[PDB]
Amino acid sequence: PDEITTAWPVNVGPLNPHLYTPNQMFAQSMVYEPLVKYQADGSVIPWLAKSWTHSEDGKTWTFTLRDDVKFSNGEPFDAEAAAENFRAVLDNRQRHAWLELANQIVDVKALSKTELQITLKSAYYPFLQELALPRPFRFIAPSQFKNHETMNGIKAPIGTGPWILQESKLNQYDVFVRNENYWGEKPAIKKITFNVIPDPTTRAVAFETGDIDLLYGNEGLLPLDTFARFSQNPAYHTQLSQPIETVMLALNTAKAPTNELAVREALNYAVNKKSLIDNALYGTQQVADTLFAPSVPYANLGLKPSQYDPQKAKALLEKAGWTLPAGKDIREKNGQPLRIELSFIGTDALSKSMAEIIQADMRQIGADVSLIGEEESSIYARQRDGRFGMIFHRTWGAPYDPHAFLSSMRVPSHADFQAQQGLADKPLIDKEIGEVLATHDETQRQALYRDILTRLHDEAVYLPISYISMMVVSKPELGNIPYAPIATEIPFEQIKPV
């Protein structure tokens, strides 16, 4: 009754707070906590840190920490424990390069038990927001380091948070229980079991049969036709949040034929997005015309949408010398046929469905899209090295969008950097991204974001598809299920069946 059963496609992993795969972010967030906490309105609030001051030049920050916090094993949380955690993370700095704060921190030291000083290389504006992320800046008991480090593994995953990992049974389940010695508000739920169920249909069936009480995830959570059916069945409860992030294609500006602006523009008129959403996504998501929705901070720029218009797509291609040979449906220019490879994870049935629609839509305007469905590692490797023509991609949701997503466009080993490599203005874009992150002149900040997002839009780097929502399926006795402000987190501690 105060225990619930739910599911996840894989086990939660070791729960090393400072590493990535195979750690599941939502679970790191259940056990480990930030100095300051992200809120829906976009601010952060005091959390493990009660308060903070900063120097006039914005580069030195001093946090006053709470003095009543214990790790779940009884050991104290204090400035020394915090400082040791920052050291452990930064001893592995190279792996955090995607996150600009990790390049910004020049020093962290405990000034006393309750005072923590962080020194930055520049007045990095998103400082607090990045401290608030699920990883890597959260705190494990230093006693649980291995040889004074965490980058080579941890002992027990001892955090300060409201949940404690009880046991993990590989490929079967993970059990968490409530921290009875939590510094903050006590969760009403005392135990959460995560059944390992990798297949979306099997998750749907597990819920139907009563095996599980709750499903909480993005558009991939369960089949969307089944989701629609569940929402009409009074025996169940379902929810669909307001949109959290964008799903789009990235187009390779550095590889023929997507290296041509005219081709990228034509592709952006070719897809009937509303129909795609109604056909493949059962009408559960929203059409996206821009990289970021207009509701995203800094992103309400009045950018012009490219509406579904096959006639205009064709005219663009013809004008660019992509014409149809006699007897053929696929355009050619300088001998070369208009062929584009679309990469996606092959076992992902939803990605595959959208890919087929996109392929069909583009064929109607004379573009031959070849589907390349591959395993994750192969797709990720393609993203890193630019071996794609078009690839499925998505933004990261709050609090990453837009600043952290944009920041990462500068990093060579990522899809967006690769996709943008063919732009003459790529260096300028990357310089402006660097500038905007350290800008405290609010006017200049908005102008830089406008210029960056406008160039990306006008250069047709992306083919935005939809703004997607979080969805929930639950037994009615659990009541309304809240959403966590951070899109990768799951607010189990706010679930209150009574």
Features:
monomer; 498 residues; alpha+beta; D-Maltodextrin-Binding Protein, domain 2; Dipeptide-binding Protein, domain 3; 15 helices; 21 strands; 24% strand; SBP_5; peptide transmembrane transporter activity; CntA-like
Short structural description:
This protein is α+β, with helices and mostly antiparallel strands. It contains 15 helices and 21 strands. The chain is globular, with a radius of gyration of 24 Å.
- Helix fraction bin: 25-40%
Number of strands: 21
Helix/strand/pairing category = alpha+beta
Number of helices: 15
CATH class of the largest domain: Alpha Beta
State the distance separating the first and last CA atoms.
Answer: 10 Å
What fraction of residues sit in β-strands? 15-25%
Protein name: Nickel-binding periplasmic protein
GO molecular function: heme binding; metal cluster binding; nickel cation binding; peptide transmembrane transporter activity; transition metal ion binding
Pfam family, one: SBP_bac_5
Function: Involved in a nickel transport system, probably represents the nickel binder.
Explain how this protein is built.
Helix content is 28%, strand content 24%. By secondary structure, it is an alpha+beta fold. The chain has two domains: 1-241 and 470-498, D-Maltodextrin-Binding Protein, domain 2, CATH 3.40.190.10; 242-469, Dipeptide-binding Protein, Domain 3 (Dipeptide-binding Protein, domain 3), CATH 3.10.105. The strands form six sheets. Strands 13, 14, 15, 18, 19, 20 and 21 form a seven-stranded mixed beta sheet that branches. The protein has a four-stranded mixed beta sheet with strand order 1-12-11-10, with no helix packed on it. Strands 4-5-7-6 form a four-stranded antiparallel beta sheet. A hairpin with a 3-residue loop joins strand 10 and strand 11 (173-178). The longest helix is centred in the C-terminal third of the chain and has 17 residues, at 442-458. The termini are close together. It is classed as metal transport. Keywords: transport protein, Protein-bound iron complex, metal transport. The assembly is monomeric. The entry is titled "X-ray structure of NikA in complex with Fe(1S,2S)-N,N-kappa-Bis(2-pyridylmethyl)-N-carboxymethyl-N-kappa-methyl-1,2-cyclohexanediamine". The protein: Nickel-binding periplasmic protein.
